[PDB]
Ligand SMILES: CC1=C(/C=C/C(C)=C/C=C/C(C)=C/CO)C(C)(C)CCC1
């Protein structure tokens with residue numbers, strides 16, 4: 001019954017880059033295919049005088065055969081016609097870290113408590129996502145208050161992802 005076409009997904013009305021700036025702690029994630037950030041994930045968002053949003057991110061990644069490594073990433077966002085939908089060019093401060101360019105949607109936020117992010121890297125032929133990821137962020141590293149949690153759960157369901165998240169631990173690995 002639920003519409004899981006990516007083109008159907010609502011995102012944050014009148015998204016405000018300035019209000020979104022600062023530190024966001026990843027509390028949960030739905031993983032894409034392939035190498036991804038593992039845990040201890042913290043993002044720092046900024047916006048400059050011209051209005052270009054950028055970010056940095058720290059987090060543990062496990063390069064295969066179980067090598068751990070605190071990845072240190074940089075992201076720059078290109079605006080689209082939708083104020084909450086961006087193209088994110090990203091890379092690591094080290095050359096060998098993953099680079100690429102992902103859709104970056106702010107699905108919902110209240111700016112001072114929670115944010116829900118979404119990226120579809122590849123569509124299915126029916127308009128659903130073949131390869132997605134999603135972060136839930138909190139301003140407080142100790143987690144969301146119940147009212148925000150309940151909103152986030154609704155957004156998770158709307159993205160057709162609600163069963164597919166895992167919690168992210170923060171234990172000082174970085
Ligand atoms: C950059 C960046 C983001 C995603 C970064 C990613 C996905 C990094 C992946 C790194 C890997 C896989 C390293 C292993 O080589 C998110 C969406 C958190 C917003 C904050 C800025």
Ligand SMILES: [Cl-]
Pocket residue numbers: 162163164
């Ligand atoms: Cl569930």
